[PDB]
Symmetry: C3
Subunit: 373 residues, 3 copies
Amino acid sequence: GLLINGLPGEGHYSDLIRMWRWDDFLRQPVVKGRVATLPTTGQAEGDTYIFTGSGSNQNRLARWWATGATTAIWEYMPPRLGWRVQVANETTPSGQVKTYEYSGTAWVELVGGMSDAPSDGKAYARESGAWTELGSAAKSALNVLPFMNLMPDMGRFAGTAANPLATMFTTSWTPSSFLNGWNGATVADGGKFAFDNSTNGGAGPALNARVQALLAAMGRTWTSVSRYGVEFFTAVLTAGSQTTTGSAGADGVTRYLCCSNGSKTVFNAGGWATVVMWLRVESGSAHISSAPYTTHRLWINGAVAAPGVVLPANQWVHLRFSMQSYNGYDNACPYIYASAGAQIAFACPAWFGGLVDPGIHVAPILTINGASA
Amino acid sequence: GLLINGLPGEGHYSDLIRMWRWDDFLRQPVVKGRVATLPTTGQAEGDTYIFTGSGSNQNRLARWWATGATTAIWEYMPPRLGWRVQVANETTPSGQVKTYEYSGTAWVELVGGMSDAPSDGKAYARESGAWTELGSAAKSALNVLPFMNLMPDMGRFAGTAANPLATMFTTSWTPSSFLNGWNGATVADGGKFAFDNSTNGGAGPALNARVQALLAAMGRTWTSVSRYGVEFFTAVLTAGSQTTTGSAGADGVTRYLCCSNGSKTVFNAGGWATVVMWLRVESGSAHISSAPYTTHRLWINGAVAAPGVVLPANQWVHLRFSMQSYNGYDNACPYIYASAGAQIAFACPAWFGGLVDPGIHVAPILTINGASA
Amino acid sequence: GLLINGLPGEGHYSDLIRMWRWDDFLRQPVVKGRVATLPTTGQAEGDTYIFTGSGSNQNRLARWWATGATTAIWEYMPPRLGWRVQVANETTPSGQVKTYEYSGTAWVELVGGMSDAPSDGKAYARESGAWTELGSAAKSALNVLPFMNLMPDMGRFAGTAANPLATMFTTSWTPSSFLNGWNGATVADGGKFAFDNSTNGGAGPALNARVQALLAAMGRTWTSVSRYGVEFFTAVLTAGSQTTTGSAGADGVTRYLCCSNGSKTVFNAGGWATVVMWLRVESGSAHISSAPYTTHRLWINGAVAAPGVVLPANQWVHLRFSMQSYNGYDNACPYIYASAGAQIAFACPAWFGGLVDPGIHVAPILTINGASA
């Protein structure tokens, strides 16, 4: 509460000039910018800077009045409990004009808002100009949803008779119908990981170099996870001498298909499919697909990748190829071409009947069969 | 920058009346509207229109000052770097008053907002006045999720021994337990679609009229999707002469149940159930359910439908009936009543134990069994 | 529309007094608060209250002008179509300063907003400063999704040969491999619920006290849900005399493990697991887990619970223990320790391969096997 009333009319002309100048300034309260010192040069009429230099003159404005003036002075306008003040020179990307609404102690940003979600524990999302509640499934991710594998042998190459529900299996190696050799490709056993293995102080079968390389790729270095685990076999596919179904990768190197699924009926759910497997190149070179065609999306250890990328040699890689096809079936779904004579190591393949995001899996997904008990 | 200072005191009366009028107007800077021309009639004191006509007087105010005045003139207010100006006559539905914030070059709408999602690749939703992070499953749809059919033979009417994982099957027609004749209804084979069929230039079995009608309905007219596909059988159910379990549709025509599921244990997940199946009426008439009971929702080719709708005759319709029931079982779950003697053609049924939205399917959803290898 | 122009040059000293008052007062149009009566005491210069008392004097300001003044009067400021007026003393939690924008008939709140979801049927959420559309799965809940159980016998203790798809079964009681006795614990048949039971006016086997207790806990008291249902057995486990694998609950009472899963391979989906089962304590005491370890979350009938909570004796409780473990397997997954000699009743166990939220289930979740047909 301050006041300027009751001026002795002898000094009335000065107050008249005051009423002229302040009223003239009141067209638009705009500040060209905050200044901790009075601009000593380059100022004229219409220039308003917030003089916030240390002292009792904080926030006092510093309009310079020279044009059409007798003597120019830094007129001071002490703000008491300031409020919204517009700013022109700088603005937000969305076109909002910067406005520091002084809350009486600090320069605060302008605020608005019309809708606030009711505090009833339900999440709301905008819909056609109105906020609509969301279900519980929105919060949950996809790496945890327990979907089921379409393989009967889990990729363990032990046959469907083996129980997928058992950590330990005694059945010997057995080829999997889900991986059929192409262009004369030969599939042979590569290795096996045994429960209670002797490599880590046990008495069971030892682990070969490929198994340690995979486990290091898995991050399974701790005893609780490296010294134990679920059993499964590994296989190495040698590309045959046949030269059918040519294709070139991103590097322009031609390669031929080496394996096929035997025309599995996996293209049903909206034509969508998903294949997840772990592989490592022991010799030669290989790539993915032929080139960007139809709808495709490749993830490499959680990183998006493009078709034709040549996978680095002698490293374990996680690939997630998900695409759409209304044809209802396909025999060459992987679209993976490898150079003749290339030794490719793979383990724990995982296929799904649609788009799923299970993350970087560690073991094949389970299912139920007659031998599952 | 401009000023009105330091006038010769002789003429101070004019500019004092000036500042008086401007101060009087400054109670609320409101414009009744924007005008490209000065209103020549029907204006008085308190009327303010933004004179934005072509010329240098753009955005100049056009307040008419006649009441209690010697001579009325269109006092002009050239705006320099305009700002928030309120508008009264028209307002938004949510009670927000229109305000054209002039950004110095155009009339910009007033803006607010207090919360912005952090830029860290995460999607947030309002929750109890705070923005809460959403999961990955929220973005994903429901038509691609690879759920499981509860049918062992996929509706192919070839028996459970037939491998669901094979595109082609050699087994002959076989009745499906999931469909059971009611009121003396008889179920007979109607047709079959064969891989490498001769109708499209092949050497396999030909396709009868029903198959072409279905394929045209499915939209699978291209060679890649019409000349190839997964095999399955079609069956036609003839309503029996029995008149038990009467019901009336939306058109008021009484009908009787013709088929039953044999009391399947599908009402488990919260009592929810879902039935998806393709059908076509060859004779007679039929409708869905009896009358609105409990919770229900019918989708016809993706279009919501109400109980009792009489399906058009001789057309393929995609039905998705979903409801809830805590009883734990039901034998007449479809609640489909057809007139006596009506010939109904159906193919590729699919059932689920809960609410799912796979869209308009083109083939029965897969499962796993002993013969799946 | 109003003006203060017309007046003689005689009595305009009051007019300029008012020009010195209004202009200086309009530094910031702030009101200390709304008042229905003029403050008769404790007011001075700088105090502004909205005099909103009943009558034609509504909304008029009541600034008291006494300091440096001759005689103080309640200057009145009739608002015509008022607008945004800031308020200082009270503010919103988010730092927003209260502002009652008068819409000409009522005191409305200030409004903002820079984004509105397009009206095209898609739900949008904020993402890195932009609104991104959401999928259909976001709206759906999780209690309804039809996920598949991993138990081959449904927990009915009837053997895998029994068809889970049939409401009724004729096979006798059979132990379940999923529940293996530990510390010498003995598992014995406890009861069975029969379709068309005679307890509710039928002719089938009667129901024992445990079954009525479970049904009352389940809420299935109506005839449609109490007199009818799916068949299943119940078993009672008696803690053995062995004292291996000691553990203490939240109350500090030591207990020992009484059952094990036989090292089932369920920790596959990101190491996540979910166990749901109904139990009732007939004698002794029991608790959950040993102490908070790693990640954990327990729901008791939909209510979150902490490790070690001693379940009330002789009551049915719905438990849902979900935890992550990357080891890939575990034999003592339940982590349930019961006092020696405690008689624990349990029925309809349900396990899943990952985090799922089926709510309070009423029957075991179904699966598919060779005998499912």
